[PDB]
Amino acid sequence: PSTNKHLKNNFNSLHNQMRKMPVSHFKEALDVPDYSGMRQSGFFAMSQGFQLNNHGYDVFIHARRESPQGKFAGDKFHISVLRDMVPQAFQALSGLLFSEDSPVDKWAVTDMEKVVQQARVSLGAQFTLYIKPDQENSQYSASFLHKTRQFIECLESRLSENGVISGQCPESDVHPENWKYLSYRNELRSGRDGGEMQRQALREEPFYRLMTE
């Protein structure tokens, strides 16, 4: 038994349930840092229940809201924007990323001052959104999958409406033509390198197909 096994065996049921659901509404947060403030999180900051830190042994500012008390199943999104526009992109998305209605409890953004300009996580993939199965038995529910898909589509729309220029999608990730910023990989069944073979495998991931079709 596994998260992905449940997705395979309920593939059409989940998809059909999702397409019948009304549009998700996300109350956007206002009492949030801008990108500069985000970089100043240090040891501890908090905005809208998301604990913030920028003091780890890595180049990211991490955001974590307490999860409902399934286990991480590898499913995650990157957001790629033009390197120069990360601060504006972050601000535009902050209402959604810190929303009390967001299905994403754990995410991270590159600290652009900690990386060389031409770095993988500088030219693109400046955000990572980590998805966890919402049910106690580590299964995804249709309600949550719908919410998650609606959420990333809201992120797409906000960036597009703000005229944010797209970034350089990492070689590791896949995305459909209608995702100009968002991309996907599964951490359990793919690597950071990528390649056509890996990208081909990722396109078959039930989770990815449920997000796109």
Partner: peptide, 9 residues
């Protein structure tokens, strides 16, 4: 070491 977008617990 510093550049991984890996989920850390």
């Amino acid at each position: 070491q510093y550049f991984m977008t890996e989920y850390v617990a």
